[PDB]
Specification:
2 copies of one chain form a homodimer. By secondary structure, the first copy, chain A, is α+β, with helices and mostly antiparallel strands. Chain A has a single domain, classed as lambda repressor-like DNA-binding domains (434 Repressor (Amino-terminal Domain), Orthogonal Bundle), CATH 1.10.260. Helix content of chain A is 58%, strand content 13%. Chain A has 4 helices and 2 strands; from the N terminus they run E-H-H-H-H-E. In chain A, helix 2 packs across helix 3 and helix 2 crosses helix 4. The two termini of chain A are 16 Å apart. The interface between A and B is medium-sized, with 32 and 32 residues. Chain B binds a DNA duplex through helix 3. Chains A, B: One of its GO terms (molecular function) is protein homodimerization activity.
DNA sequence: TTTATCCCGTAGAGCGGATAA
DNA sequence: TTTATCCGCTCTACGGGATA
């Protein structure tokens, strides 16, 4: 786990976590009450994704986040 | 710097950093080129804030973020 | 099976700008 | 001076649903 500097970096990292556990978009989406389409839009086009969707997906991946120094 | 689980919690943490360093909304907005109004809306109503905005504000506070296990 | 896209709908963001306290 | 809240605008999210 490393520092994250952009939505793109962030989505890519979460996509990796998702793949590495063999979860489909649909599994996650059902698990948290959002659309499969919505996990797709977040993964390909995260800039305009809302903070609520982020935290939901984050939770579905059994992940959290903290803030840190940018350095 | 503890684990964050919601937009409200995230905004609260970031607002605290703002105040602790004695920074105003206006000057953070000027720094990264967004509306003062946008920082206000983020601090009080983060749910539908976008990821770009979140990252722009993080940067303006010299913060970054990191992923971690939810526990 | 999996993911990406598009329709409609309603909702809200974030902009320039101007207040409103 | 600092922060919250409008208007009017354009842009997109995200929902249900259906494809591609």
């Amino acid at each position: 786990f490393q520092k994250i500097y952009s939505p793109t970096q962030l989505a890519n990292a979460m996509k990796l976590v998702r793949q590495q556990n063999g979860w489909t978009q649909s599994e996650l989406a059902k698990k948290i009450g959002i659309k499969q389409a919505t996990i797709s839009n977040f993964e390909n086009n995260p800039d305009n994704t809302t903070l609520t969707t982020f935290f939901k997906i984050l939770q579905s991946l059994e992940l959290s986040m903290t803030l840190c120094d940018a350095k």
